Amino acid sequence: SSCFPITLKFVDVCYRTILSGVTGMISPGEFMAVLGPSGSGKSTLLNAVAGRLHGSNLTGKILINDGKITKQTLKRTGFVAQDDLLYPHLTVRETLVFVALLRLPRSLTRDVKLRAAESVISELGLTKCENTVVGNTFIRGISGGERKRVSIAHELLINPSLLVLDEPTSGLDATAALRLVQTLAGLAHGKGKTVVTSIHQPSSRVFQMFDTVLLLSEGKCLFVGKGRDAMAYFESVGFSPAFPMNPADFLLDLANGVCQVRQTLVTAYDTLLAPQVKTCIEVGGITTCIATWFSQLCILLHRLLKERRHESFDLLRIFQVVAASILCGLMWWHSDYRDVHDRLGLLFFISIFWGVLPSFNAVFTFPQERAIFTRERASGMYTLSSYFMAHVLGSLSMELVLPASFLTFTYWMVYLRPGIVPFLLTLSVLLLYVLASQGLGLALGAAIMDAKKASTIVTVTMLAFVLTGGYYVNKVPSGMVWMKYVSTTFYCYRLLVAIQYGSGEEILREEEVIGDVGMWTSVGVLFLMFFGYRVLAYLALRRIKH
Amino acid sequence: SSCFPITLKFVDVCYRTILSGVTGMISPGEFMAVLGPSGSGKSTLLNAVAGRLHGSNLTGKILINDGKITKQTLKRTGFVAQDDLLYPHLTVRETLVFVALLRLPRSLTRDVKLRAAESVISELGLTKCENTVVGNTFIRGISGGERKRVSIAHELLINPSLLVLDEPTSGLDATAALRLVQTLAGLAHGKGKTVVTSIHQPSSRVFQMFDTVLLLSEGKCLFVGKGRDAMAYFESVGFSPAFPMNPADFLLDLANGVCQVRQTLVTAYDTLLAPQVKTCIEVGGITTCIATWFSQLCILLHRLLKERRHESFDLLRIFQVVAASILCGLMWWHSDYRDVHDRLGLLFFISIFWGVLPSFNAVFTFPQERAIFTRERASGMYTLSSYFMAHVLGSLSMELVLPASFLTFTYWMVYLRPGIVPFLLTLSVLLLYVLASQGLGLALGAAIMDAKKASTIVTVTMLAFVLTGGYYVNKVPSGMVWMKYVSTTFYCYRLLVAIQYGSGEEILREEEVIGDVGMWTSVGVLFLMFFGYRVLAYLALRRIKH
């Protein structure tokens, strides 16, 4: 792999000071480690050499193969970050299949996009756990050193020629962190890539696997050399250990003061190594762009299918609906339609329960997956308008199966109106109201992007929708009668009474409670709240500038 | 300190195998490290040598100063565990003052119990942050290496002569984990104590601070010696490194296979070191016991005072009560008492809101602090009956200030009955109902001890209390009329109507809604649910056998 070499030179990097004159070169086929104490800015060097600091404070010359950070050579570079962002309910094989269908170019087949995702599984040693779910801290999945190899496989699908990693071995074991360094040395030696990593606290034989070492001590680097003459260099200045110790622990003490002194390391670097490195340092149309959109939406629906039915079918949401079905069928068992005060309280309990329950569970959707979206939209996998519509279409399928089972169990126990026409009109109003209540939660969760702070604002909003719905207060004090024309509970409840009683005179053989609004101007407003709360959630997610 | 030495011998420990013949002795004034791979059972050795495995599977001779694990010599032993259990809202000084008032003996003054808690602060180096709050991951407190010194200070108040620690330096920094080992070597050398610790992955100069080393490789130990002749012993068998490396990394490779082989280490141990260690291995009344109880309750009230007002006065619970006060004063503004259907809906909204809101927030109390309670009750600081009554008395003070401010703002806006006698009877019924609704949440949170699983059972229970309360369903189908005699919402709502309308005939100048239950048999049942739900929470916490 990678028969197209690369050479990375970063003459005089200065970031504002964090970095103050870092200079070195990275030949193709080298495995380099950036060593430094926690604060020297060894994470800032990796981002500003992979093209993540966009020339604002970065005053240096990051030139890639005697060039620049032009986008033609930036698609040959992968940056593996420090935290892992994976979906739990996908297995290891189908994690890397949906990523290969989104990242690899559109002018290929589906044949060599599945053989490009199984040549990456059986190269990082993931062929044992490929049918095991990924999981998280709450789902029994895969181990944390084998969870890191899925993040590295996510970057090797596009076949990069420069791989930049940010603390791979961190939290891993003693022997899991050695086999990971042994494959990263197998990429740089066997394939011919160029790996630049930053190891925090290496070990006695992890330091033997390295090839070149960079030592940062708050800005100015102290040593750039081939990783086994590091201990023979500092004894020429006059620094040497006493007791037998790790060669990586002797260097990380010279980086912060403790010797066996910090200022003479900086002066001796600019007189013997910096003259040595800097002499060598110069020598489709319209039909294409629509079918690309619908394929981004069909992959993102199947990728998120297992996540949506984890939200809407756990056993603590089924138990709240089975309980409310039994308590309604036992309180209003074989109810009579001639006592109007009881049946109007049945029809208002349905409006409270199915407006509070869809709106509350919808404010957790977008703040839960924000780091996953902003990492993957910035990497060119998908846009916002196809990510968003895969949540709109995928949530109006799973959220319409518990209210449809509530009503079937309950409709002929409590003796509502008999017939197939009053039953299918009562189900249609109930499912339109669940979709209008859900979009109010999606609009408040996206505008605020905090799940605990928006959970109390949907409480206060839905408390005012119930009180102005038309059941508790029979006469409203004349500066509050405007308030019922914005609530979803008012328009649902006037439609349920119009189906069960009609115009009103059929029971007259209690008139302000069977009053007049209109049956076509109540379904017309529940569609304006269906479409209108989904548009205000798109515009609230458009504001997040990456 | 510790002018009463101790000598720990643990001849032939075998635990069922985890441990299979561990044998050694620990002289007074030594700092010993137990080294081993993750799985060798170096945590099981520390618990079974501090007296935490109670002779069931532990088939060995744990003898302490040629004795046994009799309770007279077990109060001279401190075991610092691995995770830290601290209250966040207490500062560092008053954390160690409440612990000193509970652990030190009762036959002292309060003078030398505060000078015994400030000679521990200015000995572990906590005199800089003594006025800084402890915090957690969510509150900005103190650093995680300085959070560990508060756990060690918790065990040095009783002045032990054997201190046993379980991975102290874990998650700490490179230089924070060196200064912690330097004070633990200052206890064993300067004072004269006996420190036995188990370090996971030590460093190059952390290994120089040790004095004796124990090396466990799955059961049978491989080396017991004075920590600087460890590398000179294995080269006499014929094992030696090649590249320069940490002496703790060479040993932890011989413990699992990897050499520069595992079975010849076990045989060579039982022929040269085991004959060497085993030749030396033999040569008040009634007024006292009540005032002790009331002092445990006065300390535990002030210790938990800052935690109770974090629960009941955050800005997301104040915003739900200010919103409901405004929505009630605007919907029923200057209401009239002659339209009875509106005022009965005002009095039923108060019963729903103040039964759902106290019961929901009470199921989080006991599962939140279970590891703190079971650690500290087992250590002899307090019992269950004084820990429990400090939550009962401390929660009926802070939970009666938001419903008392709700009613004062609202009572003369919505024009309920004028006078000081109908106002103080309406406040008294509302505060008795809040205390009865709270105990139902405490009983369900303690029986289940899971905050998410009990949060849906208080939902289903309080949904059935509302529907059988007496407002929605006017006639109940004759097998469900028993169900209203167990709900708290029924007994509160019949008392509010009896204060605002009375016997009923005063408005008769709508009779099943101003019916008959009794005003003394409704306050008598709200007290039986006050006391009865608190007794069922004590019996549900009594079942947890440590």
Residue numbers in the entry:
A (entry chain A), B (entry chain B): 33 to 48, 82 to 325, 337 to 359, 377 to 602, 626 to 662
Question: How is this structure described in the published paper?
Answer:
Abscisic acid (ABA) is a phytohormone essential to the regulation of numerous aspects of plant growth and development. ABCG25 in Arabidopsis thaliana has been identified to be an ABA exporter and play roles in regulating stomatal closure and seed germination. As a ‘half-transporter’ with only one NBD and one transmembrane domain (TMD) in a polypeptide chain, ABCG25 forms a homodimer as a functional unit, similar to other determined ‘half-transporter’ ABCG structures including the human cholesterol transporter ABCG1 (hABCG1) and multidrug transporter ABCG2 (hABCG2)39–47. In this study, we determined the high-resolution structures of ABCG25 in Arabidopsis thaliana in the apo, ABA-bound and ATP-bound states using cryogenic electron microscopy (cryo-EM) single particle analysis.
